[PDB]
C-alpha cells in the first residue's frame, strides 16, 4: 500500500501520497479540518468513504470513525476533478495500545522487586514477634504451674503467696512501662518508600482503566498477558 497512517504517542499521523505529505490531527476534531488542509494543499471537493464505500458525514468525529475503518481494515479517500480513489491502512487495537501497554509493562517490572523486598521484611518481623510471643506464653504457663504447686503442695499457703502475686504484677507493670519508654526512645537496607510503591500502583490502575476503555470501544476482550 502506497499511503499509510502511523500512530504517534498521543495523536494520529497520516502519510498521504498524491514526495508524500504528512499531517497531525487530534482525535476529537472532525474530518472537516482534514478536508481544509488537503484543500489548501492542492491548487475543491473532497469526500471520505468507509464501510463498503459509502460517504460518511464530514462533521463526524475521528475517534468514532477509525474504529469502523478497523472493523473493515481500510480507509477510502475520494477527490473531485482528479483521478485515483485512495486506499489507506488503519491502526489495529494493538497499534493504539502500543507505547502505552509497554509503559504498563515497565511499571509492573519495577513493582515486582519492591514487592519481594516487602515480603522479606514482613517475614523477618513476623518471625520476631511470633518467637518472643511464644516465649512470653511459656513464662505465663510457668507462673501458673508454680502458683498451683505452691498453693496445694505446701504449708505456706495463700496467706504467704498473695503478696508475691501483687508484687509480681507490679514488677510486670514496671517492665512494660520501661519497654514502652525505650521504644519511644524500618525498611533500611533494601530501603524504599511505601509511597513510591503506592504511586506506581496508582499509575498502573489508571493505565489499565484507559486500556479497558479502548478495548470496550473496539470490543476485543483484552488480556493482560
Ligand X SMILES: CCCCCCCCCCCCCCCC(=O)OC[C@H](COP(=O)(O)OC[C@H](O)CO)OC(=O)CCCCCCC[C@H]1C[C@H]1CCCCCC
Q: CB–CB of 49/77 below 8 Å?
A: yes
What are the φ and ψ backbone dihedral angles of 34, each rounded to 5 degrees?
A: -65, -40
Regarding 218 and contact with a copy of itself (CB under 8 A), the answer is: yes
- The sheet with strand 46-50 has its strands ordered as 54-55, 46-50, 75-79, 85-88
Q: Which residues are annotated as a binding site for Ca(2+)?
A: 162
Stretch that binds a copy of itself, among 3-11, 81-89, 111-119, 186-194 (CB under 8 A): 3-11
Residue whose CB is less far from ligand X, 57 or 165: 165
Contact status: 134 vs ligand X (CB under 6 A): no
Tell me if 170 contacts ligand X by CB under 6 A. no
Residues in 198-217 that interact with a copy of itself by CB under 8 A: 216-217
58 neighbors 37 (Cβ within 8 angstroms): no
Region 126-165 residues binding a copy of itself, contact defined as CB under 8 A = 126, 129-130, 133-134, 137, 140-141, 143-144, 147-148, 151, 158-159, 161-163, 165
CB of 140 to ligand X, least distance (A): 9
Distance (Å, rounded) from C-alpha 15 to C-alpha 6?
Answer: 7
Tell which positions 138-157 bind ligand X, by CB under 6 A: 143, 146, 152, 156
Tell me how far apart the alpha carbons of residues 210 and 116 are, in angstroms, rounded to a whole number. 28
45 and 80 in contact (C-beta within 8 Å)?
A: yes
Out of 60, 82, 172, 193, the only residue in the binding site for a copy of itself (CB under 8 A) is 60
Q: Which of 146, 156, 174, 194 binds a copy of itself (CB under 8 A)?
A: 174
C-alpha cell at 148: 498451683
Name which of 197, 204, 8 is nearest 111 in CA terms. 197
| Grid cell locating 170 | 507490679
Residues near ligand X (CB under 6 A): 143, 146, 152, 156, 160, 164, 167-168, 171
Amino acid at each position: 500500500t502506497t499511503p499509510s497512517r502511523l500512530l504517534k504517542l498521543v495523536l494520529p499521523l497520516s502519510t498521504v501520497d498524491h514526495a508524500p505529505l504528512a499531517l497531525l490531527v487530534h482525535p476529537q476534531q472532525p474530518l472537516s479540518y482534514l478536508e481544509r488542509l488537503i484543500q489548501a494543499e492542492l491548487p475543491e471537493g473532497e469526500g471520505k468513504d468507509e464501510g463498503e464505500f459509502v460517504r460518511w458525514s464530514p462533521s463526524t468525529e475521528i475517534g468514532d470513525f477509525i474504529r469502523d475503518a478497523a472493523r473493515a481494515k481500510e480507509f477510502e479517500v475520494e477527490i473531485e476533478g482528479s483521478p485515483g480513489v485512495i486506499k489507506v491502512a488503519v491502526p489495529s487495537f494493538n497499534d493504539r495500545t502500543y507505547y502505552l501497554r509497554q509503559r504498563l509493562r515497565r511499571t509492573s517490572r519495577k513493582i515486582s522487586k519492591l514487592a519481594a523486598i516487602k515480603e522479606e521484611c514482613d517475614k523477618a518481623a513476623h518471625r520476631g514477634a511470633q518467637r518472643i510471643a511464644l516465649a512470653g506464653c511459656g513464662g505465663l504457663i510457668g507462673y501458673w504451674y508454680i502458683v498451683y504447686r505452691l498453693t496445694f503442695e505446701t504449708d505456706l499457703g495463700w496467706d504467704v503467696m498473695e503478696p508475691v502475686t501483687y508484687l509480681v504484677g507490679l514488677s510486670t507493670l514496671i517492665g512494660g512501662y520501661m519497654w514502652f519508654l525505650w521504644h519511644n526512645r524500618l525498611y533500611q537496607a533494601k530501603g524504599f518508600s511505601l509511597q513510591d510503591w503506592e504511586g506506581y500502583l496508582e499509575e498502573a490502575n489508571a493505565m489499565r482503566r484507559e486500556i479497558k476503555a479502548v478495548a470496550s470501544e473496539y470490543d476485543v476482550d483484552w488480556n493482560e498477558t
